[PDB]
Amino acid sequence: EATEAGLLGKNIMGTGFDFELFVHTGAGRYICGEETALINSLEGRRANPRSKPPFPATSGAWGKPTCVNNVETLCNVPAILANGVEWYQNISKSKDAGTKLMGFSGRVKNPGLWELPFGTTAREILEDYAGGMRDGLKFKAWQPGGA
Amino acid sequence: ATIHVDGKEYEVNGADNLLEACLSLGLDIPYFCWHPALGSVGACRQCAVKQYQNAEDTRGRLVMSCMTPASDGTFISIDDEEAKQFRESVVEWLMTNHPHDCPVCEEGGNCHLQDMTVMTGHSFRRYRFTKRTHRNQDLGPFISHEMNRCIACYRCVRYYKDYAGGTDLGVYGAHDNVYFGRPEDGTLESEFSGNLVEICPTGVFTDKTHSERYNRKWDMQFAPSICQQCSIGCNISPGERYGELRRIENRYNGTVNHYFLCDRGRFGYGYVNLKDRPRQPVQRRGDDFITLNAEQAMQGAADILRQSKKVIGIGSPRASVESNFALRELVGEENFYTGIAHGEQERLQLALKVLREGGIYTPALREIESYDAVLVLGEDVTQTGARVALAVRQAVKGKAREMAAAQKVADWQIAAILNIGQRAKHPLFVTNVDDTRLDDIAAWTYRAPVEDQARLGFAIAHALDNSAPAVDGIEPELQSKIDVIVQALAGAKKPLIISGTNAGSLEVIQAAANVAKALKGRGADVGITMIARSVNSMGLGIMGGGSLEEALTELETGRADAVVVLENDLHRHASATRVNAALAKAPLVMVVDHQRTAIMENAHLVLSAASFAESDGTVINNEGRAQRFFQVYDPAYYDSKTVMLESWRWLHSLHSTLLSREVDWTQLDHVIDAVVAKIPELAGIKDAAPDATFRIRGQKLAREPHRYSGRTAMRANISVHEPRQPQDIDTMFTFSMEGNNQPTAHRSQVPFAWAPGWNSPQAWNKFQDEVGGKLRFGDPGVRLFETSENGLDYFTSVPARFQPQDGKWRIAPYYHLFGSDELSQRAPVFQSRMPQPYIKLNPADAAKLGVNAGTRVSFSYDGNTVTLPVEIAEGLTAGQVGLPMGMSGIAPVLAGAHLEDLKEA
Amino acid sequence: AFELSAAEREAIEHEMHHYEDPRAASIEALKIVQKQRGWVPDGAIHAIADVLGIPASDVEGVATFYSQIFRQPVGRHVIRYCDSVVCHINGYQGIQAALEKKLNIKPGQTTFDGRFTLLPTCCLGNCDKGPNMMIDEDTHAHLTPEAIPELLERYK
Ligand code: SF4
Ligand code: SF4
Ligand code: SF4
């Protein structure tokens, strides 16, 4: 649809900047998530990571400078460039600027996914956003990041 | 740079790795995945040390010595608590799943994993769970494979892919079920697969030929010798036990053949322990053969030579300099004929003229890899001598190396270099009759006859310099390819021109010399190398003499009634019927040889000469350097009836008994004095190894390690009374353990690599001033040549275009690696590896003959209609039939010769 | 005796049109062979190596490295049940026992009629919706051991 609308191709809305987008569906190994091993798997090789400090920003995929970014980083950048920078610094009074897709999972009453600003404690998320846990559970432990 | 290890200041290189800098200082850091010739990866974590930035620090950080650059201001520590217990944990993790089969392992006392397990000091086992097992694979007749012993250090695939360029072995597996090998079962088609025995620190890839008739490393009597299979002259360490040669090891030499051998030189030692070898002086009288000792055989041979009127000494390129000169002194100097064809001798003389009179520096094997472009003219480098082809592979990778170095990344991390490179290759232009194994990395491959390759070289030389003679009839697309070649060569800082005498024509050598002169005339740092046929063919050319055909005419005419053939088959260098008739017409034939050849029949006397495992001698490289090989064992230690004396010893005693009627068992350095006092061109060979009266700190050098076993029961099956150790007056070596193999000894030639705590082939790093570089206290062999001030002239003789004809067929050489040498094909292990004798036809030629692939056709040479099955070759040209040189019944003289009557059998 | 169909060659060549290096399309070529034939046979490695130009060792290593590139023959329906920790808390041992009692096999093996092949999977990315599984690129969440025979009867 973006290619049909004149974007994501050659001379995007009369700029001369040429960009082409592709989707590479991997077969699946958890080590492919790391950036150097993602680069190695993108080149059709086994997904072994690479040593540092030869960085991907200097020599990545096929010896060319590359940048690997998460989905949420590239979902947060267009809101930054569309709404401003001072607005992005003025949504949460914490050292980590911006919003994060947080949420609890595992025998919870409402295990879901909600976008919340940084500095929000896990307790309020668990008791109101997750709604607490189910009947007969005492919440003996938790893990901030997934596994 | 200045670093501080263990609270002690050291001065190491700045751009190298910390692991190699610490190993160059004699310190001990265990390692599994780093190799000096393969770069550094992180497949293990064995080289861990503790690094500090400031002069004083408490915690530090556990880093890898092969990933840390040896920069100015690093304060690393090795034998602290944390790094030592981490290395102990890593060797514990390697012994987590390792089979309990050390005494039934081919490595045993040659295993790096044992050395680094003992060095870390880990004996108590806390692992109680099950181990990991794998199946096995059949990797041909050379490399025995078993996967249980592996530690996943990735050195095998790193060598086999990045260094050797092989497209067979690789990594197939997962987290713990990681496999190293081939997707199917079959022979490794790479010509460098035999270096996996020493590349692998474990017993995964082992020597099958040494697995049969196996002995341990400490039981091996070693010697420093030279490989006699082709002209590259790689320094080897043959090692024997119980009177038979058992294993050839790679001998380190930083100028030629640093770390890797080829398959032919590694596995073609099966001819010296054949049971049909001449072990006695056998003389035939009447119609039956009698066996003599040395004394009365020498007396009888001298009597028959005295009764003769003229003696013809036919040398061989396989024989040493000392033996050929001993023949040249036994017979007259005016009549001494080199055992090669007239065309072969002309090509060898032209190659020597280019080498020592062309004014162009000839690179050694190590410094071929530092050149910026390679042009190979008419030479199957990957099949004649493959070590230059491996160095060409490294020179091709040099472009990726220098492009990575332009990005300010270190040179010891090969992963980043191959990351930056990405199939970026230096210009490699190979010309041959058919496809080569270098075509995978070559910038261009030219499939054409020998005359067309020579004309291509003449076109390259004319485009590089207009003073060269022009060649006409060049097609515009071929002219564009010439333009591409010359603009790649003109932009190269250090171009290289490779040729050889195996092409079968003089004009290819002339074209290579013309291109080298054109590159030198414009100020480039051009090098030129020529791959000769046999191990000491260039020494035979330097000594010189008549061709074999001149000797055959002399024998057929009747001017000489006595012929002495030294270590020559005589059927590879001339036609069989003519040689047989000439030898039958001669009233006296003496054959001084170590192999049962076809000329021993109807030969009046056979002298049991000694092979390179049983003789001392000097061989001259294709580069031009003169190295010398030493004896491994005394053949009379077991089965004392046999003598098996050296060829030069036999001929010199024959000459002495001819003159003074007395037998003189002389000494090797006397023969060296003779060759440096008689031949001024050979005056430099008394600098490779010193005199026999050379003892460092008073004592000699040991053939065998200090733990030589069974010294009082090795010969007890025939005599409990232990014989005296064989006294060696020829060399600086004693035959038993009381010599010296200390790494810090003032010497250039090392029998074997053994250090306390280092029982592996990775113990060679203690014998070098810097690891992975040159050998300490110099290198074996001296150059014997200097770059001439004034070069040759431009060779005006440009050959014409090869025009095919229907009646006459041109024989195209192929030179299979395992079948183009008599000494290689005499080995029983090469028979299951070598291909069957075939012939090669064009599709158009097969259509005009009406035959299909696999059908026998009969061709007539020397009046013999012999039949061979055909193969369809796409790269071959019309009017040419392809033949494997060096085969049984197919002499290498036929390369460039014509063929008639190509009829279907 | 393996050979490549015309559609396979067109798809593989169009995939190599998307990358600078033809080596980068090896995983997608193996995936195309998997989508057409169900698994990657021995001759397919050499076919992909000959089409792409990379050696067969690299293709074999790529095929044997990634989990969802099957080299052993599988059934017509690959059941891929979650083996991770969130579905462990939500309960995957019950549905594993239900599958083992229904198909009468062990994980990693196929049924005798070739109808199903049971396999654990690292994760499905559907952690918030309870235990999850995939059958023939069809995902299922909020699973119960009682609904396993009902869920398994809609596949051929
Ligand atoms: S087979 Fe040998 S060289 Fe290869 S990874 Fe294993 S231990 Fe290292
Ligand atoms: S490779 Fe070394 S450690 Fe392994 S079984 Fe052989 S001798 Fe023992
Ligand atoms: S390249 Fe030649 S000299 Fe070197 S090991 Fe091989 S056969 Fe021997």
Ligand code: FES
């Ligand atoms: S030697 Fe293997 S990590 Fe350095």
Ligand code: FES
């Ligand atoms: S843990 Fe099962 S879907 Fe992620």
Ligand SMILES: [Ca+2]
């Ligand atoms: Ca001797």
